[PDB]
Design an enzyme around this catalytic site. Structure first.
Site, PDB file in Angstrom:
ATOM      1  N   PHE A  18       2.856   2.904  -7.476  1.00 47.91           N
ATOM      2  CA  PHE A  18       1.505   2.641  -6.983  1.00 47.91           C
ATOM      3  C   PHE A  18       0.597   3.855  -7.140  1.00 47.91           C
ATOM      4  O   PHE A  18      -0.558   3.721  -7.549  1.00 47.91           O
ATOM      5  CB  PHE A  18       1.542   2.176  -5.518  1.00 47.91           C
ATOM      6  N   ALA A 149       1.550  -2.800  -8.966  1.00 48.26           N
ATOM      7  CA  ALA A 149       1.284  -1.522  -9.630  1.00 48.26           C
ATOM      8  C   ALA A 149       1.059  -1.662 -11.136  1.00 48.26           C
ATOM      9  O   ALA A 149       0.103  -1.110 -11.681  1.00 48.26           O
ATOM     10  CB  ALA A 149       2.394  -0.530  -9.340  1.00 48.26           C
ATOM     11  N   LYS A 202       3.947  -6.997   5.989  1.00 50.34           N
ATOM     12  CA  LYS A 202       4.176  -7.833   4.796  1.00 50.34           C
ATOM     13  C   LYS A 202       5.586  -7.639   4.236  1.00 50.34           C
ATOM     14  O   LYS A 202       6.190  -8.589   3.763  1.00 50.34           O
ATOM     15  CB  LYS A 202       3.121  -7.602   3.700  1.00 50.34           C
ATOM     16  N   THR A 259       2.887 -10.488  -1.917  1.00 54.27           N
ATOM     17  CA  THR A 259       4.165  -9.829  -1.634  1.00 54.27           C
ATOM     18  C   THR A 259       5.299 -10.827  -1.349  1.00 54.27           C
ATOM     19  O   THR A 259       6.451 -10.593  -1.727  1.00 54.27           O
ATOM     20  CB  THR A 259       3.997  -8.837  -0.444  1.00 54.27           C
TER      21      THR A 259
END
Ligand SMILES: CCCCCCCCCCCCCCCC(=O)O
Ligand SMILES: CCCCCCCCCCCCCCCC(=O)O
Ligand SMILES: Clc1nc(Br)nc2nc[nH]c12
Ligand SMILES: Clc1nc(Br)nc2nc[nH]c12
Ligand SMILES: Clc1nc(Br)nc2nc[nH]c12
Ligand SMILES: Clc1nc(Br)nc2nc[nH]c12
Ligand SMILES: Clc1nc(Br)nc2nc[nH]c12
Ligand SMILES: Clc1nc(Br)nc2nc[nH]c12
Lengths: 346, 346
Positions: A18, A149, A202, A259
């Site tokens: 990320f 990412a 998450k 996610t």
């Protein structure tokens, strides 16, 4: 002002997938981008190969991105600072190597953007809260949203939110992080707490999403898990003093649905294996972020007296050997209820 | 009361995939289930084959489900009535064949459950609103949520919401529709308008989700489309007098995220082909629900002065030959903005 801001230098502390992807984003908006990474030998390899071969394989770094092991050279001259150091190392980093960095940021009023996600085990504090012990909170913003990412790194269309207590700070960062080709778009909000809660929770819910798949459930189940789990993000946000305006935006529902649908991610496969009946010890022979987050999430929920049904059952499955089907039936033993959403309009 | 209700008879008007799946659900809660379908020859085939070979291939009907072309025998003795007749045929059905049906429902106070989704072209009215011209509104509920027909038909875990202006009516239907094995779970709400709006708009947004895929965009884009599109469902709900409490629940976000992630669905592939640059005429050689909904959705939005940016651009792509990339750039020419969510907590 809708006009973008361009800078001479940006520094990114943290060299994961990320962090690297955001360096790719910043390379289109800043002349120079340093990415700090503590290992000198690995820094040399990445600069030679022109590719983060450790955490972002198969993506060519922009020529104006330089990896570095030297904190002082990393931040020197920077006009924005990004933190993506994992939660457990954040405090240690500032204590051991942040002295000059903090002075510089304070003196030059350099905006700091928090992208780290998680809960610190010793204090049950979120990353921007930890960083705010060291850097003045007026300089602090949080970035969160649905952002794989690789998609971010290769310029595929992505929307995120930037949160700051003072909306005008978020709005400045919006102008810095948004790209000229509109491939990376930022939306301003005030709800830093909601963002940080959603970002932590998450990962725990994504394990549950795996459990559901391993139990034989389908996409209807996953959709319900997202919706019910969002209400737990909301209630924990309330209890923590957040205004909650990010919960139903890109940082909350947006990132959460992405996610939980990520079938190949570590959280999901761990949850799938648990659903198929494997014990966590056998699965543990990197750690999934949801596994790490579940314990301090529970401890924080208990401290604030916030009931988090799904997250609690996921903790029981991961940490206390609980059979996933007993957990499901316990979840579904509450009887018939109202949805639990207030009206928007009177 | 959390105790379930069991019935002697249920009737389902409408024999599509979703209608059949709900007949499967009701077969576990009612001794007898009739599914009305207008064609006698096709009714005979389905009863012989013990399988809706036209709209739910590969699923064995419960032995207590009978298809029938006779309206009077269909509803006679029923203790719940379901409508899944497509929007365009709803009014015609009541005008031509509903006379006795309406009298019976009125006299016996038989709960009616609306599962039809869409907008009527001539009146810009939603299905439960159309049905409410004929059957007293106190008997009317709406069912909506993330519910692929095949998953529902084979008993795979599914949560839906039941909406009724009087919450107590929704709560009764909750007891009827929820199954004994907790495979089909219902949540009560008041927001009938929100449910009906979400149900109609999701199909138009699912075309956009296709467009995004055909343009080369990834999952981040889809997640942003869901989130921004949800705000259009919210604003149209407000303008129509809805309380909006379903928008962020199973009927709204829940069903919307599921529908937009459905890669093999007609809405998605139509949107994908448009994104790859094919003209709608070439694609049109059944109609996708999003295509049909887009025109009257626009006309309704215009009448109420509700700006629906994504839905408007999807209408332009479908109906007015607009290049999808010009539509995207038009969408992204609004400059940098705040997220547009109010705080939940003060
Ligand atoms: C921890 C178990 C994970 C299994 C995943 C289950 C699939 C989603 C279930 C969502 C329904 C949750 C019902 C909660 C009821 C309540 O408020 O107590
Ligand atoms: C109709 C074009 C479909 C292409 C899909 C685009 C991918 C999702 C884009 C979401 C961002 C929308 C920005 C809206 C800005 C506004 O409020 O006017
Ligand atoms: Cl000690 C330490 N600090 C930081 Br910053 N990152 C790390 N990664 C592994 N060990 C680490
Ligand atoms: Cl990010 C992006 N991608 C494509 Br393809 N085309 C564009 N035009 C402006 N920004 C653009
Ligand atoms: Cl960001 C973007 N903009 C336009 Br115009 N077209 C695209 N196609 C893919 N991504 C795109
Ligand atoms: Cl005319 C008509 N009515 C109903 Br109800 N359903 C249909 N399907 C095709 N034509 C139809
Ligand atoms: Cl729907 C359902 N499925 C399975 Br597998 N087991 C159960 N036990 C109760 N309800 C159940
Ligand atoms: Cl609904 C349900 N309940 C239990 Br207990 N276990 C399951 N496995 C799949 N679906 C299930």
């Amino acid at each position: 002002k809708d006009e973008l801001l361009y800078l001479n230098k940006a520094v990114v502390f943290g060299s994961g997938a990320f962090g690297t992807a955001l360096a790719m984003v910043l390379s289109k908006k800043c002349r120079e981008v340093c990415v700090w990474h503590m290992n000198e030998e690995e820094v040399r390899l990445v600069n030679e190969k022109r590719e983060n071969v450790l955490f972002l394989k198969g993506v060519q770094l922009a020529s104006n991105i330089t990896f570095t092991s030297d904190v002082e050279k990393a931040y020197n001259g920077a006009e924005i600072i990004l933190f993506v150091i994992p939660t457990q190392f954040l405090r240690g980093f500032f204590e051991k190597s942040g002295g000059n960095l903090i002075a510089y940021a304070k003196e030059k009023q350099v905006p700091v953007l928090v992208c780290t996600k998680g809960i610190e085990r010793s204090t049950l504090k979120f990353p921007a809260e930890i960083i705010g012990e060291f850097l003045p909170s007026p300089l602090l913003s949080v970035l969160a949203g649905p952002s794989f990412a690789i998609e971010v790194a290769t310029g595929v269309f992505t929307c995120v939110s930037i949160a700051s207590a003072d909306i005008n700070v978020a709005r400045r960062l919006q102008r810095i992080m948004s790209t000229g080709d509109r491939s990376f778009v930022c939306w301003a909000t005030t709800d830093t707490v909601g963002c940080e809660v959603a970002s932590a929770v998450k990962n725990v819910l994504a394990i549950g999403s795996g459990v559901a798949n391993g139990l034989g459930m389908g996409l209807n189940a996953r959709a319900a898990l997202i919706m019910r789990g969002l209400l737990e993000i909301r209630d924990l946000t309330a209890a923590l003093g957040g205004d909650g305006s990010a919960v139903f935006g890109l940082a909350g529902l947006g990132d959460l649905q992405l996610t939980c649908s990520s079938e190949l991610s570590r959280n999901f496969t761990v949850g799938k294996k648990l659903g198929k009946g494997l014990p966590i010890e056998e699965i543990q022979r990197a750690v999934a972020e949801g596994v790490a987050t579940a314990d301090p999430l529970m401890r924080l929920a208990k401290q604030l007296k916030v009931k988090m049904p799904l997250c609690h059952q996921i903790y029981e499955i991961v940490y206390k050997k609980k059979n996933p089907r007993d957990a499901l039936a316990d979840l579904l033993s509450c009887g018939l209820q109202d949805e639990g959403l207030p009206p928007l309009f009177k």
